[PDB]
Design a protein around this motif. Structure first.
Motif, PDB file in Angstrom:
ATOM      1  N   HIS A 188       0.820  -1.195   0.000  1.00  0.00           N
ATOM      2  CA  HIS A 188       0.000   0.000   0.000  1.00  0.00           C
ATOM      3  C   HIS A 188       0.865   1.261   0.000  1.00  0.00           C
ATOM      4  O   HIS A 188       0.351   2.355  -0.204  1.00  0.00           O
ATOM      5  CB  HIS A 188      -0.937  -0.024   1.191  1.00  0.00           C
ATOM      6  N   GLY A 189       2.167   1.089   0.230  1.00  0.00           N
ATOM      7  CA  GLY A 189       3.184   2.126   0.045  1.00  0.00           C
ATOM      8  C   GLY A 189       3.993   1.958  -1.231  1.00  0.00           C
ATOM      9  O   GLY A 189       3.458   1.582  -2.275  1.00  0.00           O
ATOM     10  N   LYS A 190       5.297   2.225  -1.168  1.00  0.00           N
ATOM     11  CA  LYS A 190       6.109   2.284  -2.398  1.00  0.00           C
ATOM     12  C   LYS A 190       6.274   0.930  -3.099  1.00  0.00           C
ATOM     13  O   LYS A 190       6.678   0.893  -4.256  1.00  0.00           O
ATOM     14  CB  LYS A 190       7.497   2.895  -2.129  1.00  0.00           C
ATOM     15  N   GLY A 191       5.958  -0.169  -2.410  1.00  0.00           N
ATOM     16  CA  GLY A 191       5.949  -1.496  -3.017  1.00  0.00           C
ATOM     17  C   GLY A 191       5.006  -1.702  -4.183  1.00  0.00           C
ATOM     18  O   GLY A 191       5.309  -2.450  -5.110  1.00  0.00           O
ATOM     19  N   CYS A 192       3.829  -1.080  -4.140  1.00  0.00           N
ATOM     20  CA  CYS A 192       2.907  -1.174  -5.249  1.00  0.00           C
ATOM     21  C   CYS A 192       2.222   0.176  -5.476  1.00  0.00           C
ATOM     22  O   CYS A 192       2.536   0.903  -6.427  1.00  0.00           O
ATOM     23  CB  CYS A 192       1.829  -2.253  -4.997  1.00  0.00           C
ATOM     24  N   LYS A 193       1.280   0.482  -4.586  1.00  0.00           N
ATOM     25  CA  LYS A 193       0.347   1.583  -4.757  1.00  0.00           C
ATOM     26  C   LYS A 193       1.083   2.911  -4.876  1.00  0.00           C
ATOM     27  O   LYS A 193       0.731   3.734  -5.693  1.00  0.00           O
ATOM     28  CB  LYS A 193      -0.650   1.623  -3.585  1.00  0.00           C
ATOM     29  N   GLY A 194       2.075   3.105  -4.021  1.00  0.00           N
ATOM     30  CA  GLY A 194       2.885   4.309  -3.999  1.00  0.00           C
ATOM     31  C   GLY A 194       3.601   4.580  -5.317  1.00  0.00           C
ATOM     32  O   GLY A 194       3.756   5.752  -5.728  1.00  0.00           O
ATOM     33  N   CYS A 195       4.073   3.523  -5.982  1.00  0.00           N
ATOM     34  CA  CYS A 195       4.713   3.735  -7.282  1.00  0.00           C
ATOM     35  C   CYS A 195       3.709   4.164  -8.340  1.00  0.00           C
ATOM     36  O   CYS A 195       3.982   5.053  -9.164  1.00  0.00           O
ATOM     37  CB  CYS A 195       5.479   2.518  -7.771  1.00  0.00           C
ATOM     38  N   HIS A 196       2.535   3.540  -8.309  1.00  0.00           N
ATOM     39  CA  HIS A 196       1.453   3.895  -9.209  1.00  0.00           C
ATOM     40  C   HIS A 196       1.093   5.383  -9.064  1.00  0.00           C
ATOM     41  O   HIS A 196       0.854   6.076 -10.065  1.00  0.00           O
ATOM     42  CB  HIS A 196       0.237   2.987  -8.953  1.00  0.00           C
ATOM     43  N   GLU A 197       1.103   5.872  -7.832  1.00  0.00           N
ATOM     44  CA  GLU A 197       0.760   7.273  -7.568  1.00  0.00           C
ATOM     45  C   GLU A 197       1.865   8.200  -8.073  1.00  0.00           C
ATOM     46  O   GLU A 197       1.585   9.193  -8.734  1.00  0.00           O
ATOM     47  CB  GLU A 197       0.521   7.506  -6.089  1.00  0.00           C
ATOM     48  N   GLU A 198       3.111   7.850  -7.780  1.00  0.00           N
ATOM     49  CA  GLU A 198       4.258   8.656  -8.209  1.00  0.00           C
ATOM     50  C   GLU A 198       4.430   8.719  -9.732  1.00  0.00           C
ATOM     51  O   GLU A 198       4.724   9.788 -10.291  1.00  0.00           O
ATOM     52  CB  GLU A 198       5.548   8.140  -7.574  1.00  0.00           C
ATOM     53  N   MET A 199       4.258   7.585 -10.404  1.00  0.00           N
ATOM     54  CA  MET A 199       4.440   7.508 -11.859  1.00  0.00           C
ATOM     55  C   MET A 199       3.203   7.916 -12.643  1.00  0.00           C
ATOM     56  O   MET A 199       3.265   8.027 -13.864  1.00  0.00           O
ATOM     57  CB  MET A 199       4.895   6.105 -12.289  1.00  0.00           C
ATOM     58  N   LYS A 200       2.088   8.121 -11.936  1.00  0.00           N
ATOM     59  CA  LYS A 200       0.828   8.606 -12.498  1.00  0.00           C
ATOM     60  C   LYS A 200       0.172   7.607 -13.413  1.00  0.00           C
ATOM     61  O   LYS A 200      -0.529   7.977 -14.345  1.00  0.00           O
ATOM     62  CB  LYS A 200       1.020   9.956 -13.219  1.00  0.00           C
ATOM     63  N   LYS A 201       0.411   6.329 -13.144  1.00  0.00           N
ATOM     64  CA  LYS A 201      -0.193   5.262 -13.887  1.00  0.00           C
ATOM     65  C   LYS A 201      -0.145   3.971 -13.076  1.00  0.00           C
ATOM     66  O   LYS A 201       0.783   3.756 -12.309  1.00  0.00           O
ATOM     67  CB  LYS A 201       0.525   5.095 -15.213  1.00  0.00           C
ATOM     68  N   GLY A 202      -1.146   3.122 -13.271  1.00  0.00           N
ATOM     69  CA  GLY A 202      -1.308   1.886 -12.513  1.00  0.00           C
ATOM     70  C   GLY A 202      -2.408   1.994 -11.455  1.00  0.00           C
ATOM     71  O   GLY A 202      -2.757   3.087 -11.009  1.00  0.00           O
ATOM     72  N   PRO A 203      -2.962   0.864 -11.043  1.00  0.00           N
ATOM     73  CA  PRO A 203      -4.150   0.891 -10.168  1.00  0.00           C
ATOM     74  C   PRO A 203      -3.910   1.458  -8.783  1.00  0.00           C
ATOM     75  O   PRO A 203      -2.908   1.175  -8.145  1.00  0.00           O
ATOM     76  CB  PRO A 203      -4.568  -0.577 -10.109  1.00  0.00           C
ATOM     77  N   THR A 204      -4.838   2.294  -8.315  1.00  0.00           N
ATOM     78  CA  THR A 204      -4.729   2.884  -6.995  1.00  0.00           C
ATOM     79  C   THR A 204      -5.981   2.668  -6.129  1.00  0.00           C
ATOM     80  O   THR A 204      -5.992   3.127  -4.993  1.00  0.00           O
ATOM     81  CB  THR A 204      -4.459   4.417  -7.079  1.00  0.00           C
ATOM     82  N   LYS A 205      -6.989   1.979  -6.660  1.00  0.00           N
ATOM     83  CA  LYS A 205      -8.250   1.717  -5.940  1.00  0.00           C
ATOM     84  C   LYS A 205      -8.287   0.270  -5.472  1.00  0.00           C
ATOM     85  O   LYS A 205      -7.768  -0.608  -6.137  1.00  0.00           O
ATOM     86  CB  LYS A 205      -9.469   1.977  -6.834  1.00  0.00           C
ATOM     87  N   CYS A 206      -8.927   0.037  -4.336  1.00  0.00           N
ATOM     88  CA  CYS A 206      -8.960  -1.286  -3.711  1.00  0.00           C
ATOM     89  C   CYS A 206      -9.281  -2.373  -4.721  1.00  0.00           C
ATOM     90  O   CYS A 206      -8.511  -3.325  -4.890  1.00  0.00           O
ATOM     91  CB  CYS A 206      -9.999  -1.335  -2.578  1.00  0.00           C
ATOM     92  N   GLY A 207     -10.393  -2.204  -5.419  1.00  0.00           N
ATOM     93  CA  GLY A 207     -10.920  -3.217  -6.318  1.00  0.00           C
ATOM     94  C   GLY A 207     -10.218  -3.338  -7.658  1.00  0.00           C
ATOM     95  O   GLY A 207     -10.527  -4.232  -8.445  1.00  0.00           O
ATOM     96  N   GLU A 208      -9.270  -2.457  -7.920  1.00  0.00           N
ATOM     97  CA  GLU A 208      -8.436  -2.550  -9.111  1.00  0.00           C
ATOM     98  C   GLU A 208      -7.241  -3.488  -8.890  1.00  0.00           C
ATOM     99  O   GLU A 208      -6.747  -4.071  -9.826  1.00  0.00           O
ATOM    100  CB  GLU A 208      -7.955  -1.163  -9.505  1.00  0.00           C
ATOM    101  N   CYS A 209      -6.766  -3.603  -7.661  1.00  0.00           N
ATOM    102  CA  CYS A 209      -5.707  -4.563  -7.336  1.00  0.00           C
ATOM    103  C   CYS A 209      -6.237  -5.890  -6.831  1.00  0.00           C
ATOM    104  O   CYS A 209      -5.763  -6.945  -7.253  1.00  0.00           O
ATOM    105  CB  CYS A 209      -4.791  -3.961  -6.289  1.00  0.00           C
ATOM    106  N   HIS A 210      -7.196  -5.805  -5.902  1.00  0.00           N
ATOM    107  CA  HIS A 210      -7.790  -6.945  -5.219  1.00  0.00           C
ATOM    108  C   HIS A 210      -9.036  -7.429  -5.976  1.00  0.00           C
ATOM    109  O   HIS A 210      -9.966  -6.640  -6.204  1.00  0.00           O
ATOM    110  CB  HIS A 210      -8.240  -6.548  -3.797  1.00  0.00           C
ATOM    111  N   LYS A 211      -9.056  -8.706  -6.336  1.00  0.00           N
ATOM    112  CA  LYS A 211     -10.192  -9.296  -7.034  1.00  0.00           C
ATOM    113  C   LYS A 211     -10.289 -10.783  -6.720  1.00  0.00           C
ATOM    114  O   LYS A 211      -9.380 -11.549  -7.028  1.00  0.00           O
ATOM    115  CB  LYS A 211     -10.065  -9.114  -8.555  1.00  0.00           C
ATOM    116  N   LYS A 212     -11.401 -11.185  -6.126  1.00  0.00           N
ATOM    117  CA  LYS A 212     -11.650 -12.595  -5.821  1.00  0.00           C
ATOM    118  C   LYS A 212     -11.820 -13.434  -7.090  1.00  0.00           C
ATOM    119  O   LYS A 212     -11.310 -14.566  -7.148  1.00  0.00           O
ATOM    120  CB  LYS A 212     -12.904 -12.725  -4.951  1.00  0.00           C
TER     121      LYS A 212
END
Ligand code: HEC
Ligand code: HEC
Ligand code: HEC
Ligand code: DXC
Length: 71
Positions: free
Chosen positions: A47-71
């Motif tokens: 939820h930090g720089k391991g995944c979500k944080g990079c998506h936020e910094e690079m301005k691309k990639g999923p940042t919403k719960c249901g965009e990463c997590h899917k049953k």
């Protein structure tokens, strides 16, 4: 090698490597990291720089719960 799925209890998280190799040509963002990075990964990093944080910094990639997590 194959993509991996992180077995988060709230829903599987897919990690597609090809998209990352293409969009993150700075491979040292993830590779040749010093020791401890396999043991170190978890929810905090993800939820930090391991995944979500990079998506936020690079301005691309999923940042919403249901965009990463899917049953
Ligand atoms: C983190 C976001 C990464 C970035 C940026 C790059 N790679 Fe990667 N790589 C990463 C993981 C977690 C894994 C293993 C899980 C998987 O999905 O494959 C890998 C794997 C590789 C491999 C092996 C792939 C295979 O044999 O199919 C290679 C050769 C590799 N990584 C190289 C590579 C290069 C050259 C990158 C920059 C362009 C690059 N990776 C980005 C994580 C991440
Ligand atoms: C930078 C250092 C990154 C890290 C660490 C992680 N991700 Fe990522 N991801 C990054 C970028 C710039 C993009 C956009 C790629 C594109 O072309 O759209 C992504 C994309 C994803 C995606 C979607 C791929 C797609 O086909 O649209 C997923 C599902 C994703 N990223 C997941 C993910 C996870 C689970 C990570 C940690 C384990 C992770 N990313 C790290 C950049 C970076
Ligand atoms: C990708 C960029 C993510 C986004 C956006 C969100 N989460 Fe996440 N989360 C992600 C990963 C890769 C992991 C696994 C960490 C690991 O140990 O491999 C998680 C973890 C969780 C957890 C804990 C699951 C468990 O310990 O089994 C929860 C409860 C969780 N995530 C929920 C959650 C919510 C509510 C989000 C939106 C606010 C959210 N996540 C975003 C990747 C990503
Ligand atoms: C080290 C990089 C970049 C994040 C950082 O700077 O710490 C992060 C980005 C994604 C992380 C990988 C995600 C999938 C795996 C999760 C496992 O529980 C531990 C090993 C793996 C293979 C992780 C290893 C490492 O922790 C990586 C490659």
């Amino acid at each position: 090698a194959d993509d991996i799925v992180l077995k988060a209890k709230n829903g599987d998280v897919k990690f597609p490597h090809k998209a990352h190799q293409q969009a993150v040509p700075d491979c040292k963002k993830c590779h040749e990291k010093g020791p401890g990075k396999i043991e170190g990964f978890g929810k905090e990093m993800a939820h930090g720089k391991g995944c979500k944080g990079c998506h936020e910094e690079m301005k691309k990639g999923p940042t919403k719960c249901g965009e990463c997590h899917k049953k």
